[PDB]
CSV table of C-alpha atoms and ligand atoms in Angstrom, one decimal:
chain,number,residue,atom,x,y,z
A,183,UNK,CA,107.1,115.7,115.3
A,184,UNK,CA,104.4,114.3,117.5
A,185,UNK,CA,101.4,116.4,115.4
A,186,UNK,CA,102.9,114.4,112.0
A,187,UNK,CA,102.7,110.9,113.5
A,188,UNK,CA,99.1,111.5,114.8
A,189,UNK,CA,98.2,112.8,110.9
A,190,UNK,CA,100.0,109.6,109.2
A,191,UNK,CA,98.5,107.3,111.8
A,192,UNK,CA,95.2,108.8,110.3
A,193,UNK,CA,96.1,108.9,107.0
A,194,UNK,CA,97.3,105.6,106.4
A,195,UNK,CA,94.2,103.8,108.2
A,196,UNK,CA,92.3,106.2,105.1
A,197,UNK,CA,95.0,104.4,102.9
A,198,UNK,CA,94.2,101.0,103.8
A,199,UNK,CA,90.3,101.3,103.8
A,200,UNK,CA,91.0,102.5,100.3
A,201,UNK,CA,93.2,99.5,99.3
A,202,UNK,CA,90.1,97.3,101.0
A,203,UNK,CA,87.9,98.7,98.3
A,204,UNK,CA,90.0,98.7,95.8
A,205,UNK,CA,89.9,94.7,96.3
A,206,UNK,CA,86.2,94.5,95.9
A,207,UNK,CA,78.3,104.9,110.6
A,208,UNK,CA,76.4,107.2,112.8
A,209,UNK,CA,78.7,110.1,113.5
A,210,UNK,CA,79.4,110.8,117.4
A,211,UNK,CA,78.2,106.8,117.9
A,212,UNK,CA,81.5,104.2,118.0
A,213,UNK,CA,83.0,101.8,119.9
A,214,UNK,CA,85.9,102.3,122.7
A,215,UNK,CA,89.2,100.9,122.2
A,216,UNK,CA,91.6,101.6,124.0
A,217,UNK,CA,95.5,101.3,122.3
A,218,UNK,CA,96.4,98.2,123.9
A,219,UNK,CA,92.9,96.8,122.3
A,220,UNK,CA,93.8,98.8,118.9
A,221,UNK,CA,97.2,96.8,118.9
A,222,UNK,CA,95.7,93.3,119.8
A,223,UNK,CA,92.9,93.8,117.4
A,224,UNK,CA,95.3,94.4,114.4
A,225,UNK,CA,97.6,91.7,115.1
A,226,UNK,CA,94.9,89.3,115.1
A,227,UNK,CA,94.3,90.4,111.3
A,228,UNK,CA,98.1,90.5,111.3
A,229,UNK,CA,98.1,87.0,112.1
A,230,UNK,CA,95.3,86.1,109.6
A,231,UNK,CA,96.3,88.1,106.7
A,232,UNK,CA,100.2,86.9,106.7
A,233,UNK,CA,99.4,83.2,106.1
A,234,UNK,CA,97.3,84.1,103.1
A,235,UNK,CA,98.4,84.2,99.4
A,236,UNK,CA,97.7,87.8,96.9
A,237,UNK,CA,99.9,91.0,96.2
A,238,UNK,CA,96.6,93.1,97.4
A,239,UNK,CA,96.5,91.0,101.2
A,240,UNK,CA,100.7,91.4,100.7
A,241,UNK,CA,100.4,95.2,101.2
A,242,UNK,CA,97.8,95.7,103.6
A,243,UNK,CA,99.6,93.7,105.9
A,244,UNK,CA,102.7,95.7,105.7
A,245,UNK,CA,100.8,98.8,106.5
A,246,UNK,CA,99.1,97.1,109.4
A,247,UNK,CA,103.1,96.4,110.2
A,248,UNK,CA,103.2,100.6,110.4
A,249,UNK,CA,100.2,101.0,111.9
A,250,UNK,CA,100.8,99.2,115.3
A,251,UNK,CA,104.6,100.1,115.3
A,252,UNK,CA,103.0,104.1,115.1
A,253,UNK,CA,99.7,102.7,118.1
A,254,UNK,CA,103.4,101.4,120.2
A,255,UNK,CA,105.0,105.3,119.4
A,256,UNK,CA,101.8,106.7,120.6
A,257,UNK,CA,101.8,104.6,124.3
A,258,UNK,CA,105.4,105.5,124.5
A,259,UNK,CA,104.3,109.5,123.8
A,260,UNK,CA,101.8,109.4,126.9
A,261,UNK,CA,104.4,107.1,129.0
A,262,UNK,CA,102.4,103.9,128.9
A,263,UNK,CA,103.2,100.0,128.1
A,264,UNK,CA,101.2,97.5,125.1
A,265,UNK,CA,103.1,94.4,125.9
A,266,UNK,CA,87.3,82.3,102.0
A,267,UNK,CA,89.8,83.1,104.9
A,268,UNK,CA,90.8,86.4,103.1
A,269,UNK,CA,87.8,87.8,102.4
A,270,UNK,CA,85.7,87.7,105.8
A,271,UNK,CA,89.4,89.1,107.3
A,272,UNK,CA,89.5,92.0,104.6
A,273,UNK,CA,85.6,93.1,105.2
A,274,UNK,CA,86.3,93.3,109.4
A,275,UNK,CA,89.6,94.7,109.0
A,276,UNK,CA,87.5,97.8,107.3
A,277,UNK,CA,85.1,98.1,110.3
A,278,UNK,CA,87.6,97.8,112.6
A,279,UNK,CA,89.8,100.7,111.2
A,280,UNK,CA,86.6,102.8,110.9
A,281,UNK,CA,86.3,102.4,114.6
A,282,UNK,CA,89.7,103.5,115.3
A,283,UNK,CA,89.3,106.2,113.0
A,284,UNK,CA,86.4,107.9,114.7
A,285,UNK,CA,88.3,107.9,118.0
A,286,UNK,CA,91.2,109.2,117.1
A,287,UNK,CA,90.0,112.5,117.2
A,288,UNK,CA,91.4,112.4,120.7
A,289,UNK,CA,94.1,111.0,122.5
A,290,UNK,CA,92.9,107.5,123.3
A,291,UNK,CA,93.6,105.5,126.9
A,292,UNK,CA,96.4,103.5,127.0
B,563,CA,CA1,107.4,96.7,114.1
């Protein structure tokens, strides 16, 4: 159902800030993105993280693989369209994710 892609959406952005710390914020107050901005935002860090060697960079990138296939689910849901390196990208990646985090409270523009 719709309720348990919106919950693992969440729940694996928690997964992957985990993972980020693993390697090594003023409540009501974030950013907009919209999902079309969530989707180019994480395959930029797609694009970084895949030419990059380390089990640890390996796996985040394959949940950033779920992660915009579920943002692409989501569009489709409310009828709408989307069409060191390593560790400066992994330290980003976690602010970025926080952002999207916070909004996702709600259903978020297309
Ligand atoms: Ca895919």
């Amino acid at each position: 159902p719709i309720q348990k892609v919106q919950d693992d959406t969440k729940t694996l952005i928690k997964t992957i800030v985990t993972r980020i710390n693993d390697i090594s914020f003023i409540p009501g107050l974030h950013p907009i993105l919209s999902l079309s901005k969530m989707d180019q935002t994480l395959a930029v860090y797609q694009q970084v993280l895949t030419s990059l060697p380390s089990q640890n960079v390996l796996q985040i990138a394959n949940d950033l693989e779920n992660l915009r296939d579920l943002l692409h689910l989501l569009a489709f849901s409310k009828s709408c369209s989307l069409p060191s390196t390593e560790v400066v990208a992994l330290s980003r990646l976690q602010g970025s994710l926080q952002d999207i985090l916070q909004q996702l409270d709600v259903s978020p523009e297309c």
